[PDB]
Design a protein around this motif. Structure first.
Motif, short mmCIF file in Angstrom:
data_model
loop_
_atom_site.label_atom_id
_atom_site.label_comp_id
_atom_site.label_asym_id
_atom_site.label_seq_id
_atom_site.Cartn_x
_atom_site.Cartn_y
_atom_site.Cartn_z
N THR A 47 -13.40 -2.65 -78.54
CA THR A 47 -14.23 -3.63 -77.87
C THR A 47 -13.41 -4.89 -77.57
N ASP A 48 -14.10 -5.88 -77.02
CA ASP A 48 -13.55 -7.22 -76.87
C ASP A 48 -12.29 -7.28 -76.05
N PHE A 49 -12.25 -6.49 -75.00
CA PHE A 49 -11.10 -6.40 -74.12
C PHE A 49 -10.91 -7.70 -73.36
N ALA A 50 -9.68 -8.13 -73.24
CA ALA A 50 -9.36 -9.32 -72.44
C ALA A 50 -7.91 -9.17 -71.94
N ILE A 51 -7.57 -9.89 -70.88
CA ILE A 51 -6.25 -9.76 -70.26
C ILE A 51 -5.79 -11.10 -69.72
N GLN A 52 -4.49 -11.34 -69.78
CA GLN A 52 -3.91 -12.48 -69.11
C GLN A 52 -2.49 -12.13 -68.70
N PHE A 53 -1.96 -12.87 -67.74
CA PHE A 53 -0.61 -12.69 -67.23
C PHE A 53 0.22 -13.90 -67.53
N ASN A 54 1.53 -13.72 -67.72
CA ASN A 54 2.39 -14.88 -67.74
C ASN A 54 2.51 -15.45 -66.32
N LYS A 55 2.99 -16.69 -66.19
CA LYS A 55 3.18 -17.38 -64.92
C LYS A 55 4.22 -16.50 -64.21
N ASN A 56 4.10 -16.39 -62.92
CA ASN A 56 4.88 -15.41 -62.17
C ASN A 56 5.18 -15.91 -60.75
N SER A 57 6.08 -15.22 -60.05
CA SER A 57 6.64 -15.76 -58.81
C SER A 57 5.70 -16.08 -57.68
N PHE A 58 4.64 -15.26 -57.60
CA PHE A 58 3.67 -15.34 -56.51
C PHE A 58 2.37 -15.86 -56.99
N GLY A 59 2.36 -16.41 -58.21
CA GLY A 59 1.16 -17.07 -58.75
C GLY A 59 -0.07 -16.18 -58.95
N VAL A 60 0.19 -14.94 -59.28
CA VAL A 60 -0.80 -13.91 -59.50
C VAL A 60 -1.57 -14.08 -60.79
N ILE A 61 -2.90 -14.07 -60.71
CA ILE A 61 -3.73 -14.16 -61.91
C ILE A 61 -4.93 -13.27 -61.70
N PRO A 62 -5.59 -12.85 -62.77
CA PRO A 62 -6.92 -12.21 -62.60
C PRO A 62 -7.85 -13.27 -62.07
N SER A 63 -8.76 -12.85 -61.21
CA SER A 63 -9.75 -13.79 -60.70
C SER A 63 -11.05 -13.75 -61.49
N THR A 64 -11.22 -12.78 -62.36
CA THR A 64 -12.42 -12.69 -63.19
C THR A 64 -12.04 -12.10 -64.56
N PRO A 65 -12.94 -12.18 -65.54
CA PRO A 65 -12.78 -11.42 -66.77
C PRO A 65 -12.74 -9.94 -66.52
N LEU A 66 -12.09 -9.27 -67.44
CA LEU A 66 -11.91 -7.84 -67.34
C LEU A 66 -13.25 -7.16 -67.60
N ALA A 67 -13.66 -6.31 -66.67
CA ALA A 67 -15.02 -5.78 -66.65
C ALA A 67 -15.17 -4.51 -67.47
N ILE A 68 -15.05 -4.67 -68.78
CA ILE A 68 -15.25 -3.57 -69.70
C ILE A 68 -16.36 -4.07 -70.62
N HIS A 69 -17.55 -3.50 -70.50
CA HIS A 69 -18.69 -4.09 -71.19
C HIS A 69 -19.18 -3.26 -72.37
N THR A 70 -18.75 -2.01 -72.47
CA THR A 70 -19.25 -1.18 -73.54
C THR A 70 -18.09 -0.80 -74.41
N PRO A 71 -18.35 -0.43 -75.65
CA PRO A 71 -17.24 0.00 -76.49
C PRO A 71 -16.65 1.21 -75.85
N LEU A 72 -15.33 1.29 -75.88
CA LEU A 72 -14.59 2.41 -75.40
C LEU A 72 -14.42 3.24 -76.66
N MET A 73 -15.06 4.39 -76.66
CA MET A 73 -15.12 5.23 -77.85
C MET A 73 -13.84 6.04 -77.95
N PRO A 74 -13.54 6.52 -79.14
CA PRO A 74 -12.42 7.44 -79.30
C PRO A 74 -12.48 8.58 -78.29
#
Ligand SMILES: [Cl-]
Ligand SMILES: [Mg+2]
Length: 233
Positions: A47-74
């Motif tokens: 659960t509790d998935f999240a993502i971020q990028f380091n600063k980069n050449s073309f200024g690329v970032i996620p525009s929203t939170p990562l859309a994983i809302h349910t537990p990812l089961m085994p």
């Protein structure tokens, strides 16, 4: 639609306590996505998935939170489309298109890098007017011009032009010069940098010469790479 590389393993389960991420990038009607598949090869729910990028050449970032809302089961595997934009902080990386990523879940934070194909950064409004093309080509210092070889290509100028167009690389003019086709092309990155190109197709030569002019020539190698990929796929 433009060229989209097949998903590759970005983060193997065994390096990430069972979390396996595969991914690729796409560009869909002016919108960039980081398309991934997350698989839980562990024995705990994730659960509790999240993502971020380091600063980069073309200024690329996620525009929203990562859309994983349910537990990812085994054993479960989900497809996740993460919208990106180029409004984020800029720091010049080596290689220029490298992206460092951190993905967290409830178990830990994991790190990986991946390489952004530059064609997802080719904008829709990248077709220079002939007049402006000539003037800009001339304005750019001749030392900025760089030459590359698209090896073993057998597409006709027409097909080259159509495929490139599908990736927002526009053909501005074509010159027939004693059998040779010379295609003059423009494209524009999300950061505003123009790249002009001359593609020379010769009879009997299975290799095309791609000549690129850019005020930021360091970028050229990378345009070539994806130009090559688009023609070979
Ligand atoms: Cl997030
Ligand atoms: Mg387009």
């Amino acid at each position: 639609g433009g060229y989209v590389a097949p998903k590759a393993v970005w983060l193997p389960a065994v390096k990430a306590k069972g979390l396996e991420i595969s991914g690729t990038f796409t560009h869909r009607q002016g919108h960039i996505y980081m398309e991934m598949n997350f698989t839980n090869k562990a024995l705990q729910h994730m659960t509790d998935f999240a993502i971020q990028f380091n600063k980069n050449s073309f200024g690329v970032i996620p525009s929203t939170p990562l859309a994983i809302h349910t537990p990812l089961m085994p054993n479960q595997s989900i497809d996740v489309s993460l919208p990106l934009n180029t409004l984020g902080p800029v720091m010049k990386m080596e290689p220029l298109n490298n992206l460092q990523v951190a993905v967290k879940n409830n178990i830990d934070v994991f790190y990986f890098s991946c390489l952004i194909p530059l064609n997802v950064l080719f904008v829709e409004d990248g077709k220079m007017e002939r007049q402006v093309f000539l003037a800009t080509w001339k304005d750019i210092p001749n030392e900025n011009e760089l030459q590359f070889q698209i090896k073993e290509c057998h597409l006709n100028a027409d097909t080259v032009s159509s495929k490139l167009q599908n990736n927002n690389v526009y053909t501005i003019a074509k010159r027939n010069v004693e059998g040779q086709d010379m295609l003059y092309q423009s494209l524009k990155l999300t950061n505003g940098i123009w790249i002009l190109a001359e593609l020379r197709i010769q009879p009997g030569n299975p290799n095309y010469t791609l000549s690129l002019k850019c005020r930021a020539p360091e970028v050229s190698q990378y345009i070539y790479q994806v130009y090559d990929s688009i023609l070979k796929n």
